[PDB]
Design a protein around this ligand. Structure first.
Ligand SMILES: O=C(O)CNC(=O)C(=O)O
Ligand SMILES: [Fe+3]
Ligand SMILES: [Zn+2]
Length: 338
C-alpha cells in the first residue's frame, strides 16, 4: 500500500530476482509505483558483465555540453554538440580539475553544491548511444530484451515501438543534469548503473504530476506557450527548494553502482550525476500502462517526437473498452494507487 508514496528499495534474493516480469508485479503489489520511482539492488553474486575494461574503447559519437541558465532553483538548459571522443578520453576529461566532482562531506552536501554551481563550468554528457554492455548469455534483467507488452505487440502485431524498447548507454560526469520529465508515452523506464560514481534522483508521485505541470507552467510561461508538453523537451530544471515551497511532494534517493532504478508511468523525475559513470537504460510497459498511454499529453512542436499508436494495446488487452474508446467515449480518471 505505501500510503506515504515514498521511494522503496527492494533487496531480492537470487530466486526472487531471476524473473524481472514477475518481480515487477511483486513491487507493484507492495505499492512501489506510488512513489513514481523504486530502487532494486540485485544480490551481490549477480554480475551482468565480468570485466568493464574494454568499455574504455567505446566511441561516444556526439557528446553534449549542457548550457544551464537561470537562478534561485529555476533553470533552462540548451545543448552544444562537441567532437566525438572515446570513453577513455571522456573519463580523463571528467576526472580533470575543471570537471571533477568537488570536495564534499556527504550526499546532502554534494546536492547543495550541485544546485549552487549549476551556472559555472558546463558539464559534458554522452547520451542516447545505442547498445547494451551486458555480456552474452546474461538472461536476468537483460535490458536489451525484457519482453514486456511492448515487445509482444511489436513482434506479434508488427506495431512500431519507435526504438524506445532498445538499450541506450549514458556516460555522466559531475554535474550533468537530467531535467524534469516523464518518459515517452508516459512509459516505464529502467536504468542500471554499471560502474562509476552515483546518480541522484528526484521523483514526484504520479498522483501529483498535474500539480508539477501547473507549477512549471507558472514559472516557465514562454516555454509553456510554445508547447503543450514542453517538459518533454527535458530542458527544465526546478530545485527541491522550489518544490517544497510550492507544496509539490517529492522524494530523493541516490543510485550507486550495481543498482537498478525503475520509473513508473507518469512518475516525474530528474536528477544529476555525481562524477564519471556509465549507465544503461530502456523503456518498457505492462498492462497497467495502457490507460496512461491512452491519455499521454504529447509534444506538439517538433515532428521528430515519439508517438506510439495505442489502438493495438486497447484492442488486445482492453477488448471490453475498445469500441467505447474508438468512439472517443472512454473517459476516466486514473487511480495511480491501484
Ligand atoms: O540517467 C539519466 O540521465 C536519465 N535517466 C532517466 O531519466 C531514466 O532512466 O528514465
Ligand atoms: Fe527518465
Ligand atoms: Zn514540444
Amino acid at each position: 500500500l505505501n500510503p506515504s508514496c515514498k521511494i522503496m528499495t527492494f533487496r531480492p534474493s537470487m530466486e526472487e530476482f531471476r524473473e524481472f516480469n514477475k518481480y515487477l508485479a511483486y513491487m507493484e503489489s507492495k505499492g512501489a509505483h506510488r512513489a513514481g520511482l523504486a530502487k532494486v539492488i540485485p544480490p551481490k553474486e549477480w554480475k551482468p558483465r565480468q570485466c568493464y575494461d574494454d568499455i574504455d574503447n567505446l566511441l561516444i559519437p556526439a557528446p553534449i555540453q549542457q548550457m544551464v541558465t537561470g537562478q534561485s532553483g529555476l533553470f533552462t538548459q540548451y545543448n552544444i554538440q562537441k567532437k566525438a571522443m572515446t570513453v577513455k578520453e571522456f573519463r580523463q576529461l571528467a576526472n580533470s580539475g575543471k570537471y571533477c566532482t568537488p570536495r564534499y562531506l556527504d550526499y546532502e552536501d554534494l546536492e547543495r553544491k550541485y544546485w549552487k554551481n549549476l551556472t559555472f563550468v558546463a558539464p559534458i554528457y554522452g547520451a542516447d548511444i545505442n547498445g547494451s554492455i551486458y555480456d552474452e548469455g546474461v538472461d536476468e534483467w537483460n535490458i536489451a530484451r525484457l519482453n514486456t507488452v511492448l515487445d509482444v505487440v511489436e513482434e506479434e502485431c508488427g506495431i512500431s515501438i519507435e526504438g524506445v524498447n532498445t538499450p541506450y548507454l549514458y556516460f555522466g560526469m559531475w554535474k550533468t543534469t537530467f531535467a524534469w520529465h516523464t518518459e515517452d508515452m508516459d512509459l516505464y523506464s529502467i536504468n542500471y548503473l554499471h560502474f562509476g560514481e552515483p546518480k541522484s534522483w528526484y521523483a514526484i508521485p504520479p498522483e501529483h504530476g498535474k500539480r508539477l505541470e501547473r507549477l512549471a507552467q507558472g514559472f516557465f510561461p514562454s516555454s509553456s506557450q510554445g508547447c503543450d508538453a514542453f517538459l518533454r523537451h527535458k530542458m527544465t530544471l526546478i530545485s527541491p527548494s522550489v518544490l517544497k515551497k510550492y507544496g509539490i511532494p517529492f522524494d530523493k534517493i541516490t543510485q550507486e553502482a550495481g543498482e537498478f532504478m525503475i520509473t513508473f508511468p507518469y512518475g516525474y523525475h530528474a536528477g544529476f550525476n555525481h562524477g564519471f559513470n556509465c549507465a544503461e537504460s530502456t523503456n518498457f510497459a505492462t498492462v497497467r500502462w495502457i490507460d496512461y498511454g491512452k491519455v499521454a499529453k504529447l509534444c506538439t512542436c517538433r515532428k521528430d517526437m515519439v508517438k506510439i499508436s495505442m489502438d493495438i494495446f486497447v484492442r488486445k488487452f482492453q477488448p471490453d473498452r475498445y469500441q467505447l474508446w474508438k468512439q472517443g467515449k472512454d473517459i476516466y480518471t486514473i487511480d495511480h494507487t491501484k
